[PDB]
Design a protein around this ligand. Sequence first.
Ligand SMILES: Nc1ncnc2c1ncn2[C@@H]1O[C@H](COP(=O)(O)OP(=O)(O)OP(=O)(O)O)[C@@H](O)[C@H]1O
Ligand SMILES: C[S@@+](CC[C@H](N)C(=O)[O-])C[C@H]1O[C@@H](n2cnc3c(N)ncnc32)[C@H](O)[C@@H]1O
Ligand SMILES: [Mn+2]
Lengths: 136, 279, 566, 370
Amino acid sequence: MKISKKQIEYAIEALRANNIITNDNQYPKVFKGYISSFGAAVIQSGLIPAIIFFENEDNDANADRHKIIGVLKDIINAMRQQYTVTDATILVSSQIPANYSMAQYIIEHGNTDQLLKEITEAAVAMKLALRMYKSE
Amino acid sequence: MTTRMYVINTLSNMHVGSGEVNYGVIANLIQRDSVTNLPNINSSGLKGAIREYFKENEDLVRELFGSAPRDEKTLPGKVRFFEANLLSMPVRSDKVPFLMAISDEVLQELITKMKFFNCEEATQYISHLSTLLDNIKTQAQGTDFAYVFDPLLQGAIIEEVSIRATCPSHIPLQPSLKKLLGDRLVILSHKYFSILSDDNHLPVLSRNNLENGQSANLWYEQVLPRYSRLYFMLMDGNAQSEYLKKFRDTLCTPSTIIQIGANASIGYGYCQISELSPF
Amino acid sequence: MKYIAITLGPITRTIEMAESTKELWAASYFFSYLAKKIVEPFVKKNRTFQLPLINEEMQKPHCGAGLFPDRYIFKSEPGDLELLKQHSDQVLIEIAGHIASPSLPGTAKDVSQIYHYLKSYIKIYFIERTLESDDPHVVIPACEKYLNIIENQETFPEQEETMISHQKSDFLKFLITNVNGKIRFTGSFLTRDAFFESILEISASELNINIQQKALEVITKYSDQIWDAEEIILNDNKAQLRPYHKYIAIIKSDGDSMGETIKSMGAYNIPITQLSKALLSFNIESINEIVAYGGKPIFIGGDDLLCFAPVCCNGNNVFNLVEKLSTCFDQCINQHLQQYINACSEAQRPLPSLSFGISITYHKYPMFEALHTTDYLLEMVAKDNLFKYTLSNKNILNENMKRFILKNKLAFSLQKHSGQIYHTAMSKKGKSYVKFNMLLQKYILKNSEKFLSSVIQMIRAHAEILQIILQNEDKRTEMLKNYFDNNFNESCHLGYTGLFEDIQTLLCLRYQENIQDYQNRNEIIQQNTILTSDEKEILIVSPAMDAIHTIFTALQFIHFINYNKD
Amino acid sequence: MNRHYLITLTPMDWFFFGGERTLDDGKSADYISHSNKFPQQSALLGMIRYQLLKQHNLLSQFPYTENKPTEKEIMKTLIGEQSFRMTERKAKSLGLGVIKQISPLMLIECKDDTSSRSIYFPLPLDDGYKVSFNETSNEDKVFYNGIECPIPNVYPASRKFFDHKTYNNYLFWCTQGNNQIKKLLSDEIWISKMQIGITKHVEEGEDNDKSFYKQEFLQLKKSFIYAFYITLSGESELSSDIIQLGGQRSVFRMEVESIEENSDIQEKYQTAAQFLTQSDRLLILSPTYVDNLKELSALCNFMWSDSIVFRNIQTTNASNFYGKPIKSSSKYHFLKPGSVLYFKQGKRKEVEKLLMDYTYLRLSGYNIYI
Ligand SMILES: Nc1ncnc2c1ncn2[C@@H]1O[C@H](COP(=O)(O)OP(=O)(O)OP(=O)(O)O)[C@@H](O)[C@H]1O
Ligand SMILES: C[S@@+](CC[C@H](N)C(=O)[O-])C[C@H]1O[C@@H](n2cnc3c(N)ncnc32)[C@H](O)[C@@H]1O
Ligand SMILES: [Mn+2]
């Protein structure tokens, strides 16, 4: 899983878009742990349980943990764009609607192999891009 | 009797050292064709490997490959070896462990080289290969393609470039083409084949040197995946019939295994050479 | 009145027909010797000279480099051309006699036929020209214009007989091969006019160990045996032998836009004698400080310099040697061209400087390939001749692209014993060079700031992320600091905060200089309508990745110097 | 009466032509070999002789067999006595049987269809440069290691002067166009490859002392072939086959095309080169040898020339062929294709006479000009 620069730029834009990075280039310190733990949760619990856990907004978390799921969706949508559209391509370049939650989308669209790969790569990009900012 | 095509059909992972200066991470890289940037084996490497296999036959080696280095007799070799080009390479799939990947441009180059060398019994091969290529181009209609020839293998996924292999139910694959190009054969564009055989996709291995538990050295090696198929043309000059016959029979015998590559003691580069068949 | 102009010898061909350290020294000093004894008459009898400052101690041997370029235009008197011609074949005759001195391991010696070969090979061209004007800054361009085109004639040595016994028709080979001689060394007329061999003795000139003496004792034709003797002597000198004691650095430098500087001084009514003064003083100081550092001067005291130096002696780098050479050249330029300095630099102009080419290779891996690599680094990388050559081949060139030509650059490659090249180029103008030199001084251990080796692989692996951070203009320094802090965020890394911030500042400075030098150039190259994509790709230099690669190569050089195989 | 053939050589793989430095000489750096772009015309002669006896089945096979006194004069009437001995350059005949005339090797672009063959020539050293010689005013002469020479003035023929930092006519090759010259760079015609070679040396007790060499192999671009013209008497049908043109087993496809017998090949080559002629020049098309270049310099206002090296393998009919090859006794310095000799007023016939006095060289394909 080599560093994909385009996915890093996608992660930067999505982190700014989902109100994680402040105008001064700082973020709540707990988000580091959120990004780090999401990959482990996906690997050793399953993609749907991990997404459901991190998408919940009724959590007793020190910050808005659900922002990372929105950033994930933004990175995935950016990757669906700039997909080489051809008859032979496996990848579905259909953008995830904003009204649908991420958990529903994987539930309704039952081809998890593409979604799992995209979510794993987007999480790696998230963790690598969070290091450009101050860890306040 | 003049020019015969041979297929290499490696049984292990090959590493043929390019010996060139390195700009990057992998300290040891494999040889590639200068123009096509496709993996290749130099004619010197093939000659050395086959000579080492036949070293116990002094007369055969002297008659076919020539005099040994720093021998005063200065005997040229009656056999000319041509560069080995990559024909088919294994590609990771999901329906099956691997797939035999042959690109349309490598097929065109094979047809062109067969016409240029006028290989033995190559007329029917060229005609049928050209029919295959024309039918493939007709079905493709200028778009990127991935074509399999088994109804079971339809819908196979090439993991690295993420393309699904369709089955053209209007194109025939003759049995000799299966014997030449390989089993579980997929035909794809050279655009995908270049990605599948570049320095970022073919295997890279980390290797260590330990001294009482202390890592003395570290480096990386890249290898050609096993079961890869390479073809080279052998120009049998007008030589002794008996030595040529013995060499051809020994090479074609299924009991023969030839090591072309670097890491011999760790089983790199063992191959099974087969000549072109009728049809 | 008229002037007489001189060009001397097919120097590049003579260099190519030679492979040894003795060879490289001998060809250059043979041409310098020819210059000395061809201009001895016109200088012993006083003639107002304006091309070199041929006075002081140039005729005096300093250490042996040759201070005489082959660009001579005197003043003229009625009847000096015949003087020049008869003394030209006379000096050729004395050279033929000099080789005909049985002081070398020769077998049979001729005089007349050796002289015939030497005349048919050595190109000694005189230009007489009625320049109806009294001004040097106009005289020099007008006569160099003609001597450049005159240099396109070819002198044929028709036929040589070089196989066996005593009948070969080439003799420059012995004049250039068996310099010095039999063993206590003997000398040739080169050595008499001069006052050091193999490849390893000046790579490990720090242990205060005299390998020449012990090697001579062991050996008592020549070069191979003494090469092997030196090799195994510093092989069993393993006790204090570091990996940089077996690596050889070749330094090649040339003056940047000398003719352009001459033309700029002509506008401000400034004599070329000041430029001659500065060049000669720089050459003398260069020889002095090169022998002081621990290396060897080989080639010339003109506007070039080929030096064979060890990578590190007495805690001094080859990069320290390059910095001292650049400082010496700048000091001489400022001291003598002070008028030009404070007259053309106020409004705007780049001052004359020297581009540098450094090659560091094993003591093995023969020095012919290393010399060609050094030539490539100096010419096509340090002097930006790739850009100019590629554009001139396709007949684009033109003034818009010519103004983007960059000079005053240092290019160096390090080929470790394996085949891994570490090659970068950086500008010696600006703060990036001084930060680079200070970093090398800082983190290279003496015989005590600590160096981290895992930052090196972070630079390589995270190069794309560093490119994004560098391209983010507004918060580049902040983002770089945050990245270097979030990575290396462990307890052991608190002791290397100085290294991290030094790397960050050097990288930012390198990126700024890179963008200033290359951004418009790359944009206009991209728009060019006849360039092939291959040429565009080999010509478009990414500002950020080049800075990242420069920092990476600097760090790897520091690690390569520091780490011993223990 | 004589029969003329056009022989085209198509490379089947990477080739190499040896220069003065070969991989196993006694000199210092005998592990790097660089490849000349063209074979020597002596290599062409040896090619033709080898194929000629191949068709007639007369070779040496293994021991140093001797030939009975019928094969001896059949080889006399087939190829002659010796190889291309440069010693007999002033001989008014080819010293070889059957073979009478060999044209200088030509670079031919065969693109598609029958169409036409585009003969490629090196750029004359003054392509877009107008040389303006002595405006006769008794002043401002030059000494070219010798006697008077009248101060060449080179302008960009399109003012400024000759700037040598932007001179690249020696990196270009040229061919006929629709009244303009088509210029091809040298690196587009040829591709260079450096090969690393070793002896694996496995065994037990061998000295690993010389087991490393570097070889330079060149590849002609796809639509590019070598060709030359031959003249044969006592007709031996030179057939198409697989040939060797020297250098680490270099293989070429020989195609033999017959042309009209009432045609000398020399003016065919000069008709190909006609598009590069100027009245004031002498464009050197093939390497040119003169025993005394001082005379040639004395007969011209400029020598915009270059030097090339010649060394031939000397072998007779009764030669070993299987041992160390006795190479030529002298390395000879020829001019380079593209060199130009700027003669003075008149004296053009004199320099032509000087150049043409070597008839062996002219018949072999050397000393050809336009
Ligand atoms: N003593 C001297 N005084 C003045 N000029 C000198 C002296 N010695 C040499 N020169 C000048 O050096 C020039 C040769 O420099 P060179 O050709 O190596 O570099 P350049 O063309 O100026 O640089 P670049 O290749 O970077 O554009 C000659 O034109 C000559 O006038
Ligand atoms: C003389 S001009 C170039 C002309 C070139 N030397 C020739 O012979 O045509 C300046 C260059 O010549 C070279 N040069 C001049 N004098 C030299 C000398 N004595 N030894 C070696 N190289 C010399 C250096 O490369 C320098 O940059
Ligand atoms: Mn210079």
